Curated annotation (Swiss-Prot):
Stated family: Belongs to the glycosyl hydrolase 22 family.
Record carries keyword Transmembrane: no
Gene that produces this protein: LYZ
Further information: Lysozyme C is capable of both hydrolysis and transglycosylation; it also shows a slight esterase activity. It acts rapidly on both peptide-substituted and unsubstituted peptidoglycan, and slowly on chitin oligosaccharides.
Protein name, as recorded: Lysozyme C
SUPFAM superfamilies according to UniProt: Lysozyme-like
Length: 129
């Protein structure tokens, strides 16, 4: 599913990401924009052999099982395909673990390079939230 911007904002807020671990909703919307272009089906292979999955591009080494990332963990206890659903519940639950892991949203390199330090409130402009 390709979410609209305000549609994703509303879903992320309903699932409890606004101010989760102190990150305002606009940070999460900005992260999704630059990780996946709001596309739940996005996948991207990494140099290390892992793959990133879904609207927040969650990686198969640590977080989800894709069956092809040797010596990886599955700390979110899900198949990586669960992160491609139109239902973002699994991606949000896993994102909450990742952003709690010590480096905050720096775990997302699109957030650090394109969102951190910017006017991230712009990403929720116009939305009725």
């Amino acid at each position: 599913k390709v979410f609209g911007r305000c549609e994703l904002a509303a879903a992320m807020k309903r699932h409890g990401l606004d101010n989760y671990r102190g990150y305002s909703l606009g940070n999460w919307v900005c992260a999704a924009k630059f990780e996946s272009n709001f596309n739940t089906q996005a996948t991207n292979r990494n140099t290390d052999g892992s793959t990133d999955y879904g609207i927040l591009q969650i990686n198969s080494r640590w977080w989800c099982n894709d069956g092809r990332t040797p010596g990886s963990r599955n700390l979110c206890n899900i198949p990586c395909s669960a992160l491609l659903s139109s239902d973002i519940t699994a991606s949000v639950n896993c994102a909450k673990k990742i952003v709690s892991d010590g480096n905050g949203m720096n775990a997302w390199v699109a957030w650090r390079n394109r969102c951190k330090g910017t006017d991230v409130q712009a990403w929720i402009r116009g939305c009725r939230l």
